[PDB]
Design an enzyme around this catalytic site. Sequence first.
Site, PDB file in Angstrom:
ATOM      1  CD  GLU A  26       1.795  24.531 -32.660  1.00  0.00           C
ATOM      2  OE1 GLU A  26       1.615  24.221 -31.456  1.00  0.00           O
ATOM      3  OE2 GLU A  26       2.894  24.350 -33.219  1.00  0.00           O
ATOM      4  CB  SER A  47       7.992  25.967 -20.707  1.00  0.00           C
ATOM      5  OG  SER A  47       8.045  24.926 -21.660  1.00  0.00           O
ATOM      6  CG  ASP A  78      13.819  34.830 -32.270  1.00  0.00           C
ATOM      7  OD1 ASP A  78      14.052  35.782 -31.504  1.00  0.00           O
ATOM      8  OD2 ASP A  78      14.369  33.712 -32.188  1.00  0.00           O
TER       9      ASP A  78
END
Length: 129
Positions: free
Chosen positions: A35, A50, A101
């Site tokens: 990442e 975003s 989540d």
Amino acid sequence: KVFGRCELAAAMKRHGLDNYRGYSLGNWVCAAKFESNFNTQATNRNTDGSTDYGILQINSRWWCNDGRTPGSRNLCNIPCSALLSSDITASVNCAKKIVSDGNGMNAWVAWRNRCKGTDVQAWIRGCRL
Ligand SMILES: [Br-]
Ligand SMILES: [Br-]
Ligand SMILES: [Br-]
Ligand SMILES: [Br-]
């Protein structure tokens, strides 16, 4: 700050991520490598406007406020700049929220495509945990 593999593993273990929600430390380190390449200051802008921030590339649309992503939630109640810090505490606290989540670590595209179903143990090999 650019973490070393074993150095990040230890900091993450110390922060309660090993086996959090059932995900072994190897998963978290693999995720970070792909990442951000272990760079706390990594940022990348998405086509929707975003931006992803930090070591775990947490998105401004739902998790943090960057003052420039209209209609965003700040589920982790934190400015996105806090995520670029040398101290990984905020990134770790927010990640724990993301992973609980519903979709688990599939929330991280690089994890799904490059870590999921591979020998993640290799990521922690050789480290004094
Ligand atoms: Br490496
Ligand atoms: Br592991
Ligand atoms: Br730290
Ligand atoms: Br899960």
